[PDB]
């Protein structure tokens, strides 16, 4: 563990001239990134060359747009340090203090505390979804079209070596993709990874901050409800997302659920595709196995 930290301490001090690292520890990690807490005060998100090429660039542009344009008491990252190159990206900002929302914590809250948190969330999403996004119009994401392109990449690579059961799962998804209407609604700026491990609470169990707008863009309004609607051990549950949808208002709940259900069905294929693009066999295997788990669950 000691070695990662030394290397990143060196890089931080090297690229940010007057910055002195008195302490540094690993605070989280993704498949291709590592985040560090520095001087018990700064978060530094870091990445070495992936399929970002412009990964931390977009994320930084989104923080800069949001810090200019949001009116909210909810805190988000405000970038003070950035280094962006092809081979290395680093973003630093002051750590937002608080406690991440979990299902356990939620279950200890009174009904009223739960209501007020749901309202805070609905309010934040209403404010962000309502922004005029002209000044960030580069950050458009078309999920349907992305899936089509990923399907083509599958066809060009490993599709012919998949099993019949795997192929059928994929084709059955594509048929559903082609029949759905859930990509034809309102587009807006969405966080696009809006799960409870990105939501911070203050000492009264109210929403105090939101992190990791790394996947944000102009996309279907339904996107920001995918995790709030998810029924799993990591998320609070379907009722939570429904109530939030009612508070948010002017949105078709049944289509939001259809959108989540389609995204969930896509997951094993998304996983396979990630493995192909990043040359990681392990993801290809995991996604294929998951197709069997889902096929046999009923």
Ligand X SMILES: Nc1nc2c(ncn2[C@@H]2O[C@H](COP(=O)(O)OP(=O)(O)NP(=O)(O)O)[C@@H](O)[C@H]2O)c(=O)[nH]1
Ligand Y SMILES: NCC[C@H](O)C(=O)N[C@@H]1C[C@H](N)[C@@H](O[C@H]2O[C@H](CN)[C@@H](O)[C@H](O)[C@H]2O)[C@H](O)[C@H]1O[C@H]1O[C@H](CO)[C@@H](O)[C@H](N)[C@H]1O
Residues that bind Mg ion (CB under 5 A): 212, 214
Position 270 contacts ligand Y (CB under 6 A): yes
Candidate segments 69-77, 100-108, 146-154, 267-275, binder of ligand Y by CB under 6 A: 267-275
Q: Is 215 a catalytic residue?
A: no
Q: Which does 69 bind (CB under 5 to 8 A by kind): Mg ion, ligand X, ligand Y, none?
A: none
Question: Nearer Cβ to ligand Y, position 21 or 224?
Answer: 224
Provide the CA 165 distance to its chain's centre, in angstroms. Answer: 30
Minimum distance between the CB of residue 153 and ligand X, rounded to whole angstroms?
A: 21
Closest to ligand Y by CB, 96 vs 141, is 141
Residue nearest to ligand Y (CB): 30
Q: Is 141 helix (H, G, I), strand (E, B) or coil?
A: coil
Measured CA to CA in angstroms, residue 210 lies from 36, 115, 176, 198 at distances of 17, 18, 33, 6
For residues 81, 85, 87 and 90, what is the CA-based torsion angle, rounded to 10 degrees? 10
CB of 89 to ligand X, least distance (A): 9
Q: Which of 17, 120, 168, 193 is catalytic?
A: 193
Residue with tokens 């066809």: 155
**Rounded to an integer, what distance in angstroms lies between the CA atom of residue 268 and that of residue 290?**
6
Q: How far is the CB of 194 from ligand Y (least distance, A)?
A: 11
**Binding-site residue positions for a gentamycin:** 212
Which H or E element spans position 126?
helix 111-129
Strand 199-201 and strand 207-210: the pairing is antiparallel
Which residues bind to ligand X, rule: CB under 6 A? 27-30, 33, 35, 43, 45, 47, 95-96, 197-198, 211-212, 214
Residue 33 vs 72, nearer CB to ligand Y? 33
Rounded distance between C-alpha atoms, residue 5 and residue 56, angstroms: 20
Q: Which pair of structure tokens corresponds to residue 148?
A: 């089509």
132 alpha-carbon distance from chain centroid: 21
* Contact with ligand Y (CB under 6 A) among 142, 215, 243, 290: 215
CA dihedral 156, 168, 171, 191 (to 10 degrees): -90
Tell me which of 59, 120, 220, 230 binds ligand Y, using CB under 6 A. 230
From 89-97, 165-173, 244-252, 260-268, span contacting ligand Y (CB under 6 A): 260-268
Q: Could you say which of Mg ion, ligand Y, ligand X, none residue 267 binds, taking C-beta under 5 to 8 angstroms by partner kind?
A: ligand Y
| 217 within 8 A of 61, measured Cβ to Cβ | no
Q: Does 32 bind ligand Y (CB under 6 A)?
A: no
- Report the nearest approach of ligand Y to the CB of residue 281 (Å): 16
For the chain, the C-alpha Rg in angstroms (whole number) is 20
**Burial of residue 265 (number of CB atoms within 10 Å: 0-12, 13-18, 19+):** middle
User: Measured between alpha carbons, how far is 15 from 235 in angstroms, rounded to an integer?
Assistant: 38
What, of ligand X, Mg ion, ligand Y, none, does residue 96 touch, CB below 5 to 8 Å by kind? ligand X
Phi, psi of 189 (to 5 degrees): -70, 120
- Tell me which residues touch ligand Y (CB under 6 A): 30, 193, 215, 230, 232, 263-264, 267, 270, 274
Residues annotated as catalytic (active site), given as ranges: 193
């Amino acid at each position: 563990n000691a070695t990662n930290v030394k290397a990143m301490k060196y890089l931080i001090e090297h690229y940010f001239d007057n910055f002195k690292v008195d302490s540094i520890e690993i605070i989280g990690s993704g498949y291709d990134s590592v985040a560090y807490l520095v001087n018990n005060e700064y978060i530094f998100k870091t990445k070495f060359s992936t399929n970002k090429k412009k990964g931390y660039a977009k994320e930084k542009a989104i923080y800069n747009f949001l810090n200019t344009n949001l009116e909210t008491n909810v805190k988000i990252p405000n970038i003070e340090y950035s280094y962006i190159s092809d081979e290395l990206s680093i973003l630093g900002y002051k750590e937002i203090k608080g406690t991440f929302l979990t299902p356990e914590i939620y279950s200890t809250m009174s009904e009223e505390e739960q209501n007020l948190l749901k309202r805070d969330i609905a309010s934040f999403l209403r404010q962000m979804h309502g922004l005029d996004y002209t000044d960030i119009s580069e950050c458009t994401i078309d999920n349907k079209q992305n899936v089509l392109e990923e399907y083509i990449l599958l066809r060009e690579t490993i599709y012919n070596d998949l099993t019949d059961i795997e192929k059928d799962y994929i084709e059955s998804f594509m048929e559903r993709l082609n029949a759905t209407t859930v990509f034809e609604g309102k587009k807006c700026l969405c966080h696009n990874d809006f799960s409870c491990n990105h939501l911070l609470l203050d000492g009264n169990n109210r929403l105090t901050g939101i992190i990791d707008f790394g996947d944000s863009g102009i996309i279907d309004e339904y996107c920001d409800f995918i995790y709030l609607l998810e029924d799993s051990e990591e998320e609070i549950g379907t009722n939570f997302g429904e109530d939030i949808l009612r508070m948010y208002g002017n949105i078709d709940i049944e289509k939001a659920k259809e959108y989540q259900d389609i995204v969930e069905e896509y997951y094993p294929i998304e996983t396979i595709v990630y493995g192909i693009k990043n040359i990681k066999q392990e993801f290809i295997e995991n996604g294929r196995k998951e197709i069997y788990k889902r096929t046999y669950k009923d």
